[PDB]
Amino acid sequence: PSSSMADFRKFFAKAKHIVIISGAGVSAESGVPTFRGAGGYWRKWQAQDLATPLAFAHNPSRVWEFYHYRREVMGSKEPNAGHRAIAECETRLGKQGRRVVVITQVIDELHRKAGTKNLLEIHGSLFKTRCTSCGVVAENYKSPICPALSGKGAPEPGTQDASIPVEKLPRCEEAGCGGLLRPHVVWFGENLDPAILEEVDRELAHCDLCLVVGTSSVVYPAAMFAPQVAARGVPVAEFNTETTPATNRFRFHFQGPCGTTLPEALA
């Protein structure tokens, strides 16, 4: 994998449809707890525990406390240099007739916060709910999301479970349903939305340059988007603090934090 910024810039200057795949490293560079590293524990657990169908079926109140806390911290976190570079590039290139699109693995909406408009959130969003009864999805930014979660979600180890009864957790406001809401967040072991994936496949087919930023390239099928693209002639360039299992299959690899290497790459 090449590490020449000059070569990538030559592809970039000539690229017309740029696909950027961003992972949890970009949010971590904003101080956003990922609960996947190195990236924070929530009282005893990480996202491999609470972000599962298992955790929600066993203790939906604990799963809601977890996500309520993450919603609440997003009011203190800001987009970093990588977000701004990615957003600014999209606007500058959009005026030149060139399209930049961000396929993100994260749910904290920091890309949208920076001004990115072409955003595909393959794993959902902290600020969208889904009804476990009728399936309707809704944006939701209310703090707290429901009254019984007010002041809840404290992340400190040894903090007592809210144990909120299911009827007082966020409920579907669609008339006639009142079903139990869950975060519109793809959990481990759930199938991604086929419509979003069809939109992703459409972007991967028409793009002529691909960037993979802040991704450990171990979460599927998100780690499969890039190799499917490189195998069409399209250059793939990785921006990550470390080498991932998919490094040897990329045209470029730029070691470093995304906030250091992306502003130079997207300039």
Partner: peptide, 4 residues
């Protein structure tokens, strides 16, 4: 394709 399920989320690993």
């Amino acid at each position: 394709f399920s989320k690993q």
